[PDB]
Design a protein around this ligand. Structure first.
Ligand SMILES: *[C@@H]1O[C@H](CO)[C@@H](O[C@@H]2O[C@H](CO)[C@@H](O)[C@H](O)[C@H]2NC(C)=O)[C@H](O)[C@H]1NC(C)=O
Ligand SMILES: *[C@@H]1O[C@H](CO)[C@@H](O[C@@H]2O[C@H](CO)[C@@H](O)[C@H](O)[C@H]2NC(C)=O)[C@H](O)[C@H]1NC(C)=O
Ligand SMILES: *[C@@H]1O[C@H](CO)[C@@H](O[C@@H]2O[C@H](CO)[C@@H](O)[C@H](O)[C@H]2NC(C)=O)[C@H](O)[C@H]1NC(C)=O
Ligand SMILES: *[C@@H]1O[C@H](CO)[C@@H](O[C@@H]2O[C@H](CO)[C@@H](O)[C@H](O)[C@H]2NC(C)=O)[C@H](O)[C@H]1NC(C)=O
Ligand SMILES: *[C@@H]1O[C@H](CO)[C@@H](O[C@@H]2O[C@H](CO)[C@@H](O)[C@H](O)[C@H]2NC(C)=O)[C@H](O)[C@H]1NC(C)=O
Ligand SMILES: *[C@@H]1O[C@H](CO)[C@@H](O[C@@H]2O[C@H](CO)[C@@H](O)[C@H](O)[C@H]2NC(C)=O)[C@H](O)[C@H]1NC(C)=O
Ligand SMILES: *[C@@H]1O[C@H](CO)[C@@H](O)[C@H](O)[C@H]1NC(C)=O
Lengths: 193, 86, 169, 50, 50
């Protein structure tokens, strides 16, 4: 209190109907553009030759209009199929397809009706205020390599924590958030802790 | 001013790069600044080096909730023409 | 239709507005060709650059990263691709040059080598390349120790398979 | 000689065959000519438009 | 007498130009779908893991 993608369809269709209406005032090489003024001041044998040029021109006008409507309806159908797919995948579910339902991690969507269309309101999560840390692939302890179950090992400069990858929430490294696999002599970048 | 799109008269060629406003072509755009009409090479965006190293990581400490709109045409006007009466 | 002759041009006026429609149609399809390119390639806000010292865990991206001594600052494989493929008629130039589009792809490629998938959702957050590779292995249901214990083999296979695209093209 | 058109004529770097009187390209437009007194061939270029 | 002969050329050339313009609309609608698929692959394979 924007909608140009909907105003474009309205404008293109009115602009085609106006051209179709206005081609009804060309002679196409006849004496008059109005059929009654050929019928009133001519007799059938010579009215016919003038009427045929008007028929030829107006038929071609009409055919051009119908072909360009058929090409434009096929573009509107692709749009409506995409909007049906967004209604199923963004309003009736949560999507993982990147950029399909807005920019960021999709949370939910709400539909709204428009004059010949639909407006989706996409709610997304956008991470903010990032900080720097030191990382390591694995920890070495007792000659064993430890990997995080779900997260990353981070250091604040002096201490090592595990955190989830999208929100900073540091916790102690225990045998409940890690698992073991192998020795600490094969992986490139193990640190001791 | 001679572009690759043709010869352009009535616009000053500045040296700075803005976002594209009116597309001229072959990389040139025009805009009403300050008061006059100027023509420039468009800019793609601001530059950014990422502090990449082999033991550094960036982790976010907060978030925002974003809501954005998306508009789609579904339908058009149903029209008929009687071919004979036309 | 007429070729600069007033006799034909006056007869043509009797056909109405067919030739304003034809031009409207061709203009409408010449604008959407630039709209087509804008939506494939302008998928970044920033132009990201890659670091000068490039140690990505054994992975080698040198045949797909931009080359300054080349034409238009293209990558080595973008060159093999650009080498393999009057009377009222004119051809209009595209709005984005080829230099601009190669700039866009190098920003996408430096964003992904360096931040993973974080730059397509917000601000780019750097992560070491092998830890990103381990996240991607998690995404297909393999554990992370399988990447970290096979790092050199996985990197050699990747380098040797990028080397074959270049031959086959 | 009967070849009729309009445009701008320049001097060229073609070499006809002694019996050949004018040249044309793909799409069959006349793009060269021989003039019947100098025996020199001339390039034909349409007059700028846009 | 030249009106009748010029109209026969006008009709043919108009037909040919309009055929050219229809087939370009039909070819552009196909290039458009390919570019729409390329834009989805750039989002889902380059900025994500599918
Ligand atoms: C993480 O650390 C890096 C490197 O220390 C920071 O990168 C800085 O980026 C600015 C760009 O404005 C450069 O001018 C500095 O030279 C860089 N190094 C510094 C400040 O030491 C980066 O900003 C840090 N990231 C965060 C989120 O704080
Ligand atoms: C890294 O984090 C650790 C733990 O959060 C910090 O160590 C604690 O710091 C507080 C500061 O008030 C002390 O009271 C505690 O005794 C410390 N040890 C613990 C909790 O075991 C450490 O200071 C942080 N390092 C940096 C560089 O910020
Ligand atoms: C990550 O990169 C750093 C710096 O580029 C590496 O540190 C170098 O390590 C080698 C051998 O370990 C030393 O000879 C160099 O002197 C180090 N450089 C500096 C500036 O101290 C590190 O080894 C790399 N690998 C990791 C951290 O796994
Ligand atoms: C981490 O600690 C281990 C010991 O737990 C260190 O391993 C020793 O390394 C030296 C030099 O390579 C050897 O001479 C010793 O025989 C090793 N001892 C054991 C028990 O393995 C290792 O060097 C430490 N690394 C770091 C980076 O602190
Ligand atoms: C990445 O691979 C390329 C191969 O495409 C390496 O560059 C070439 O290596 C050969 C062998 O030494 C040299 O003869 C060429 O002069 C190199 N440069 C070219 C072909 O431009 C490159 O060294 C590899 N990167 C690393 C870090 O090993
Ligand atoms: C056409 O006739 C003129 C003379 O009427 C010729 O002109 C001569 O050309 C030679 C070059 O071969 C010159 O050395 C003479 O000075 C010219 N004389 C004059 C009076 O112009 C011309 O060569 C003839 N060309 C042809 C193809 O017949
Ligand atoms: C634009 O910058 C170039 C720098 O190479 C300079 O030569 C040129 O004179 C500048 N033009 C204007 C109008 O400032």
């Amino acid at each position: 209190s924007a909608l140009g993608k909907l105003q474009d369809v309205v404008n293109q269709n009115a602009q085609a109907l106006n051209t179709l209406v206005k081609q009804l005032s060309s002679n196409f090489g006849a004496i008059s553009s109005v059929l009654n003024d050929i019928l009133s001041r001519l007799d059938p044998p010579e009215a016919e030759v003038q009427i045929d040029r008007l028929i030829t021109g107006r038929l071609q006008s009409l055919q051009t209009y119908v072909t360009q409507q058929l090409i434009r309806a096929a573009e509107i159908r692709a749009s409506a199929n995409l909007a049906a797919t967004k209604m199923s995948e963004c309003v009736l579910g949560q999507s993982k397809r990147v950029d399909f339902c807005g920019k960021g991690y999709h949370l939910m969507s709400f539909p709204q009706s428009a004059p010949h269309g639909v407006v989706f309101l996409h709610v997304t999560y956008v991470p903010a205020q990032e900080k720097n840390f030191t990382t390591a692939p694995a920890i070495c302890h007792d000659g064993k390599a430890h990997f995080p179950r779900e997260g990353v090992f981070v250091s604040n400069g002096t201490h090592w924590f595990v955190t989830q990858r999208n929100f900073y929430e540091p916790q102690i490294i225990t045998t409940d958030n890690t698992f073991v696999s192998g020795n600490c002599d094969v992986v490139i970048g193990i640190v001791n802790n | 001013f001679q572009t690759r799109a043709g010869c352009l008269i009535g616009a000053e060629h500045v040296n700075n790069s803005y976002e594209c406003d009116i597309p001229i072509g072959a990389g040139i755009c025009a805009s009403y600044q300050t008061q006059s009409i100027i023509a420039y090479t468009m800019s793609l965006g601001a530059e950014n080096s990422v502090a990449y190293s082999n033991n550094s990581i960036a982790i976010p400490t907060n978030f925002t909730i974003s809501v954005t709109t998306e508009i789609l045409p579904v339908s058009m006007t149903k029209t008929s023409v009687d071919c004979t009466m036309y | 239709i007429c070729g600069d002759s007033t006799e034909c041009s006056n007869l043509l006026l009797q056909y109405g507005s067919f030739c304003t429609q034809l031009n409207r149609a061709l203009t409408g399809i010449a604008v959407e060709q630039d709209k087509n390119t804008q939506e494939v390639f302008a998928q970044v806000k920033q132009i990201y650059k890659t670091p000068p010292i490039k140690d990505f865990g054994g992975f080698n991206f040198s045949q797909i990263l931009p080359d300054p001594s080349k034409p238009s600052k293209r990558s080595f494989i973008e060159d093999l691709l650009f080498n393999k493929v009057f009377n009222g008629l004119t051809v209009l130039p595209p709005l984005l040059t080829d230099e601009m589009i190669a700039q866009y792809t190098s920003a996408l490629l430096a964003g992904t080598i360096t931040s993973g998938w974080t730059f397509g959702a917000g601000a780019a957050l750097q992560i070491p390349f092998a830890m990103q590779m381990a996240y991607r292995f998690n995404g297909i249901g393999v554990t992370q120790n399988v990447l970290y214990e096979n790092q050199k083999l996985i990197a050699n296979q990747f380098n040797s398979a990028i080397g074959k695209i270049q031959d086959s093209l | 000689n009967g070849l009729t058109g309009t445009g701008v004529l320049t001097e060229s770097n073609k070499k006809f065959l002694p019996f050949q009187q004018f040249g044309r390209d793909i799409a069959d437009t006349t793009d060269a000519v021989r003039d019947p007194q100098t025996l020199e061939i001339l390039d034909i270029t349409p007059c700028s438009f846009g």
